[PDB]
Amino acid sequence: QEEVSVIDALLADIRKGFQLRKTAR
C-alpha cells in the first residue's frame, strides 16, 4: 500500500492550503 500513501500526502496539501486561506480572510 505504498501507492496509497502517495495520494494521502497529495490530499493534505488541499486541507492545509485551505487552512491558510480561511484564516487569511
From Swiss-Prot:
Domain WH2: start-end pairs: 8-23
Places the protein is found: Cytoplasm, Perinuclear region
Signal sequence, renumbered to the chain: none
Top-rank taxon, per record: Eukaryota
Tissue-specificity statement: Widely expressed. In the kidney, expression is apparent in podocytes and some tubule cells.
Function: Severs actin filaments and accelerates their polymerization and depolymerization.
Disease: Focal segmental glomerulosclerosis 5: A renal pathology defined by the presence of segmental sclerosis in glomeruli and resulting in proteinuria, reduced glomerular filtration rate and progressive decline in renal function. Renal insufficiency often progresses to end-stage renal disease, a highly morbid state requiring either dialysis therapy or kidney transplantation.
Family per record: Belongs to the formin homology family.
Domain-level remarks: The WH2 domain acts as the DAD (diaphanous autoregulatory) domain and binds to actin monomers.
Subunit-structure text: Interacts with actin at the FH2 domain. Interacts with DAAM2.
Protein name (record): Inverted formin-2
Residues of the full protein shown: 967 to 991 of 1249
